Write an enzyme that holds these catalytic residues in place. Structure first.
Site, PDB file in Angstrom:
ATOM      1  N   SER A   1      46.457 -14.961-121.693  1.00 45.64           N
ATOM      2  CA  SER A   1      45.337 -15.917-120.520  1.00 45.64           C
ATOM      3  C   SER A   1      45.856 -14.851-119.050  1.00 45.64           C
ATOM      4  O   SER A   1      45.611 -15.188-118.353  1.00 45.64           O
ATOM      5  CB  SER A   1      46.626 -16.921-120.260  1.00 45.64           C
TER       6      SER A   1
ATOM      7  N   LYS B   1      51.508 -24.370-116.125  1.00 43.25           N
ATOM      8  CA  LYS B   1      50.763 -23.682-115.118  1.00 43.25           C
ATOM      9  C   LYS B   1      51.139 -24.055-113.733  1.00 43.25           C
ATOM     10  O   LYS B   1      51.564 -23.637-113.486  1.00 43.25           O
ATOM     11  CB  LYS B   1      49.768 -23.019-115.164  1.00 43.25           C
TER      12      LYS B   1
END
Lengths: 50, 100, 50
Positions: free
Chosen positions: B46, B89
């Site tokens: 990611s 996140k």
């Protein structure tokens, strides 16, 4: 059977079989009329070490 | 991670010749790169996009814009892809002072 | 994208799927037009040996 291919018998795990074998150029040959380096083979086909 | 790193490197080296042809700092320069561990391994690709800008910054000399975090996976032609776990996140980056 | 992809069907473990194969240049091509050092591939995608 265009040039550079030939039949080859083989005794696999269960009976024989008529697998072919094939070869070919990898780069154009006349890169240099004056050249001097081994025309190294490159084998392929899940080769065993032997 | 090694895979994603390599493809990101190739994309970087490709984008630069596509964009700013005269520069060649990246085609010829040994470069160490350091990505600290801690990302969950399934989520590990990611971070890829960040690298591709990291390198580019060094290849142009401009420091990045202040407090501007980013993420997301990249492909060899640069088509970004979705990444999971957005909530953790967001909540973590919110308190770091990031703004954009 | 015009240069370097083609859609590829594949028989994934559950159903079919439409993976894209992607390829790209890796370095300026013509630093020395007259030289002879063949351009290596670097394959990716965690391929098995076969």
């Amino acid at each position: 059977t265009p040039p550079g291919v030939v039949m080859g018998l083989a005794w696999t795990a269960m009976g024989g079989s008529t697998l072919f074998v094939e070869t070919s150029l990898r780069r154009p040959q006349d890169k240099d009329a004056k050249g001097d380096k081994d025309g190294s083979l490159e084998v392929t086909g899940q080769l065993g070490e032997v | 991670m090694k895979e994603s790193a390599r493809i990101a490197y190739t994309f970087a080296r490709a984008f630069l010749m596509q964009h700013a042809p005269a520069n060649d700092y990246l085609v010829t320069s040994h470069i160490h790169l350091h990505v600290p561990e801690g990302a969950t391994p399934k989520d590990g690709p990611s971070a890829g996009c960040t690298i591709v800008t990291a390198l580019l910054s060094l290849a142009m000399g401009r420091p990045v814009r202040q407090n501007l975090a980013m993420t997301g996976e990249v492909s060899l032609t640069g088509k970004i892809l979705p990444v999971g776990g957005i909530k953790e996140k967001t909540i973590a980056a919110k308190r770091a002072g990031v703004t954009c």
